[PDB]
Ligand binder design. Structure first.
Ligand SMILES: *[C@@H]1O[C@H](CO)[C@@H](O[C@@H]2O[C@H](CO)[C@@H](O)[C@H](O)[C@H]2NC(C)=O)[C@H](O)[C@H]1NC(C)=O
Ligand SMILES: *[C@@H]1O[C@H](CO)[C@@H](O[C@@H]2O[C@H](CO)[C@@H](O)[C@H](O)[C@H]2NC(C)=O)[C@H](O)[C@H]1NC(C)=O
Ligand SMILES: *[C@@H]1O[C@H](CO)[C@@H](O[C@@H]2O[C@H](CO)[C@@H](O)[C@H](O)[C@H]2NC(C)=O)[C@H](O)[C@H]1NC(C)=O
Ligand SMILES: *[C@@H]1O[C@H](CO)[C@@H](O[C@@H]2O[C@H](CO)[C@@H](O)[C@H](O)[C@H]2NC(C)=O)[C@H](O)[C@H]1NC(C)=O
Ligand SMILES: *[C@@H]1O[C@H](CO)[C@@H](O[C@@H]2O[C@H](CO)[C@@H](O)[C@H](O)[C@H]2NC(C)=O)[C@H](O)[C@H]1NC(C)=O
Ligand SMILES: *[C@@H]1O[C@H](CO)[C@@H](O)[C@H](O)[C@H]1NC(C)=O
Lengths: 170, 106, 50
């Protein structure tokens, strides 16, 4: 609040304007980064009320209705595990909307495969989507269909191990 | 990476201090519902599509390519046999045509 | 107002139904990428002292 200091500071010209403009550019760049990463879909997709995906369990990654924040158990664990002229601008997207964007992406990739990323969301059963992905890596569809229960059990076990590993590692 | 949709090709254009890419892409449109099954059960054997997907319009079963609706008769030429019908969950019963059958029939 | 993320779309998922496209659209989109800047040189002695 010193007027004499500001009067002397005016002799140095537009340094303050350059610093403010650089910080403003960084601040808008962060919002642009979040927009590029998460806002890749213009349709907010939702999962069906019945979670019948041919034995595949997505409870750990889908949003929990019981929680007020509408986050997944994994996302809730991730949020729990992260702990003079200065101002902090709030982010343009709140955590709820970023969670909603991830929920839309998860619903699209579960119910529609990769079709929603390339155009309109075309529904396909999940054991058929998995067979298509198996064909993508050069494995025949029959291998997926015959061993569907084992693959579903392995996927659920791996998701649980991921949650345990995140909860158990600082 | 090269536009929204299934990428077909791209065109470069010069711009002052820059480049403009015209991405020509293929976007699916006018989708239609069909009833689908993982496999077709015929003669105690399970048939799976070589490259397409089994669809049903309500009464008849066909096999079509995944990205465009082109129904074709389910034959031995576009399906492969692996195992019986007891393992695959959701297999439905339908006939599988054989192209060789009229040749020795006549 | 509070922003709307996107138009709501509920995909009709079921265990035995698929959606197959019957038509297509050839879509051309533009992507603008900067390549170079203006090449600037500053005479340090002339700038500071003339
Ligand atoms: C999907 O996975 C979830 C989470 O593992 C299962 O929920 C568990 O169900 C058992 C049996 O009722 C409970 O003892 C656990 O406490 C539940 N865990 C949680 C985190 O709620 C769920 O049963 C699985 N299957 C389906 C169809 O949702
Ligand atoms: C599903 O598609 C098949 C193939 O076009 C339909 O079968 C045809 O139905 C018409 C309508 O009477 C007949 O004139 C043709 O002779 C049929 N073709 C064959 C090979 O049988 C079938 O009706 C369609 N089913 C539905 C519910 O639309
Ligand atoms: C598809 O065809 C198979 C074989 O023709 C059917 O399996 C038979 O089902 C009856 C009644 O459930 C049993 O008495 C037979 O012993 C079964 N045979 C075999 C070889 O498994 C099957 O039920 C048919 N599915 C549908 C939906 O019609
Ligand atoms: C495929 O069938 C489903 C179910 O009949 C259609 O989904 C319905 O679409 C209408 C039209 O807007 C909605 O009012 C319903 O709420 C939808 N139902 C569900 C369960 O989501 C779907 O539109 C059909 N697909 C096509 C391409 O016609
Ligand atoms: C697929 O979509 C194209 C749109 O590009 C359809 O072409 C149009 O068809 C209508 C009716 O015949 C004409 O009035 C328009 O002038 C056509 N547009 C163009 C650009 O040619 C085409 O008919 C559609 N095909 C199917 C099977 O639905
Ligand atoms: C789909 O689920 C119903 C029960 O909701 C079941 O009767 C049917 O056999 C299932 N179909 C497939 C292909 O899994």
């Amino acid at each position: 609040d010193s007027t004499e200091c500001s009067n002397l500071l005016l002799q140095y010209g537009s340094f303050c304007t350059q610093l403010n403009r650089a910080l403003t550019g960084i601040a808008v760049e962060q919002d642009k980064n979040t927009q590029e990463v998460f806002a890749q879909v213009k349709q907010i997709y939702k999962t069906p009320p019945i979670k019948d995906f041919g034995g595949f369990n997505f409870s750990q990654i889908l949003p929990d209705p019981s929680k007020p924040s509408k986050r997944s158990p994994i996302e809730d664990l991730l949020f729990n595990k992260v702990t003079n002229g200065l101002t902090v601008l709030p982010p343009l997207l709140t955590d709820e909307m970023i969670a909603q964007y991830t929920s839309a992406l998860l619903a699209g990739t579960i119910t529609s495969g990769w079709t929603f990323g390339a155009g309109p969301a075309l529904q396909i059963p999940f054991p058929m989507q998995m067979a298509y992905r198996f064909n993508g890596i050069g494995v025949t569809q029959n291998v997926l269909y015959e061993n569907q229960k084992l693959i579903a059990n392995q996927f659920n076990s791996a998701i649980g191990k991921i949650q345990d590993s995140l909860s158990s590692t600082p | 990476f090269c536009g929204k949709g299934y990428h077909l090709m791209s065109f470069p254009q010069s711009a002052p201090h820059g480049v403009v890419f015209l991405h020509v892409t293929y976007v699916p449109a006018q989708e239609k519902n069909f009833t689908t099954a993982p496999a077709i059960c015929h003669d105690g054997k399970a048939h799976f599509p070589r490259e397409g997907v089994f669809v049903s319009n309500g009464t008849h079963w066909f096999v079509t390519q995944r990205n465009f609706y082109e129904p074709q008769i389910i034959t031995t030429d576009n399906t492969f046999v692996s195992g019986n019908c007891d393992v695959v969950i959701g297999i439905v019963n339908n006939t599988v045509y054989d192209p060789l059958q009229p040749e020795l029939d006549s | 107002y509070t922003m709307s993320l996107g138009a709501e779309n509920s995909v009709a998922y079921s265990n035995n139904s698929i959606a197959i496209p019957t038509n297509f659209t050839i879509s051309v989109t533009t992507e603008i990428l900067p390549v170079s800047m203006t090449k600037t040189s500053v005479d340090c002695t002339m700038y500071i002292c003339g």
